[PDB]
Amino acid sequence: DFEDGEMESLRNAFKQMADEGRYEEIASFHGVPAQCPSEDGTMVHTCCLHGMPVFPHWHRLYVSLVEDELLARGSGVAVPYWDWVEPFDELPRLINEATFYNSRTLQIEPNPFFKGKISFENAETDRDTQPELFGNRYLYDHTLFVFEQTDFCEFEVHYEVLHNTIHSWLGGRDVHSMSSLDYAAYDPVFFLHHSNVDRLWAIWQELQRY
Amino acid sequence: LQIEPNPFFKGKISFENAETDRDTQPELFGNRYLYDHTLFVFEQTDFCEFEVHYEVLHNTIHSWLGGRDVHSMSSLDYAAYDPVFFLHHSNVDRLWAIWQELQRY
Numbered sequence A: 001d002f003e004d005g006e007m008e009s010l011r012n013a014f015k016q017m018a019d020e021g022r023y024e025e026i027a028s029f030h031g032v033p034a035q036c037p038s039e040d041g042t043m044v045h046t047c048c049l050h051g052m053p054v055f056p057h058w059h060r061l062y063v064s065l066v067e068d069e070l071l072a073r074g075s076g077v078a079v080p081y082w083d084w085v086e087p088f089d090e091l092p093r094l095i096n097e098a099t100f101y102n103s104r105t106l107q108i109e110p111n112p113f114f115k116g117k118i119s120f121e122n123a124e125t126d127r128d129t130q131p132e133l134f135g136n137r138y139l140y141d142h143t144l145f146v147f148e149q150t151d152f153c154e155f156e157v158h159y160e161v162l163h164n165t166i167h168s169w170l171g172g173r174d175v176h177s178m179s180s181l182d183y184a185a186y187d188p189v190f191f192l193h194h195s196n197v198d199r200l201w202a203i204w205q206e207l208q209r210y
Numbered sequence B: 001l002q003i004e005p006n007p008f009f010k011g012k013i014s015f016e017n018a019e020t021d022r023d024t025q026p027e028l029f030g031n032r033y034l035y036d037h038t039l040f041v042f043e044q045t046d047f048c049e050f051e052v053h054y055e056v057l058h059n060t061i062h063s064w065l066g067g068r069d070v071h072s073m074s075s076l077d078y079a080a081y082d083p084v085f086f087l088h089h090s091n092v093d094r095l096w097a098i099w100q101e102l103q104r105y
């Protein structure tokens, strides 16, 4: 439901976040350079929480964080949710094409949402979209069964497996992509994904109110 | 076993330190008029009559493929640096080829 203005402003704000240091600094919270030794600690682990019921919470905050700094970079709107529950013949416009036309500069420029840079390994996030991603309506039924959940933890497990799905379909075969937990955050679509996931959680909460 | 950059996606213009880009005009998609255009190109008995319609027809795609960017297919200057160029022109050549054989018939 975006407009050309909102999209170009989102692209620009995020760009400002991108050529400067920041977004990588945020993606490193989830990503492969590990920061979390515990409990003694004997070894170090990645910081993001994934087996636990507090998986949503964590990632919830993640999106919050990035959106905050997005807005502070002059974004007209907060981070949108990309609803993949509805089947699609193509990828969303914002993230799909490698280059967008800049109206203000009157020139074609690289879409910041196409790929994120991983400079500490001197690589870039790539995407190999599995054909299973395009057009399947199974996600509808799956989210439906996620919402059925009275208990919070049942909710959480189905919620998070369902969330794993998109990661897998989108960044399938490359090592530096959405599919591998280590490098998943560096691909901007991450928060575009995890806001949407968050939305689902939000809905459930409201359902629970009912 | 890894995903790599497509060589055909963009050519690089290193003497001006840029890369070819593409702003695809919406008319390029689902254009069925090109059919009839080509048909009128074939109709020509004389060579120059063939050449002019053939080449305007050829200009069409150049224009609509890399429209708005300066370093692109649309500008005659940098059009060659986009790989699609020969992919384009071979097809252009094919048309001429057909015409040649037509002329034989």
Ligand SMILES: *[C@@H]1O[C@H](CO)[C@@H](O[C@@H]2O[C@H](CO)[C@@H](O[C@@H]3O[C@H](CO)[C@@H](O)[C@H](O[C@H]4O[C@H](CO)[C@@H](O)[C@H](O)[C@@H]4O)[C@@H]3O)[C@H](O)[C@H]2NC(C)=O)[C@H](O)[C@H]1NC(C)=O
Binding pocket: A034, A035, A036, A037, A044
């Ligand atoms: C809160 O965050 C801070 C910083 O984000 C974090 O401190 C950092 O911890 C990491 C470890 O998780 C440190 O990173 C290491 O730094 C050393 C050099 O100082 C490197 O040698 C390490 O390389 C690894 O691999 C080597 C083999 O190739 C091993 O020999 C080595 O043991 C390492 O496994 C690794 O990059 C980082 O230096 C600190 N930085 C700071 C500012 O202290 C802190 O741990 C976090 N606190 C909590 C409680 O989580």
Ligand code: CUO
Binding pocket: A030, A048, A050, A059, A163, A167, A184, A194
């Ligand atoms: O959140 Cu940890 O990545 Cu989907």
Ligand code: CUO
Binding pocket: B058, B062, B076, B079, B089
């Ligand atoms: O011919 Cu189309 O390129 Cu000079």
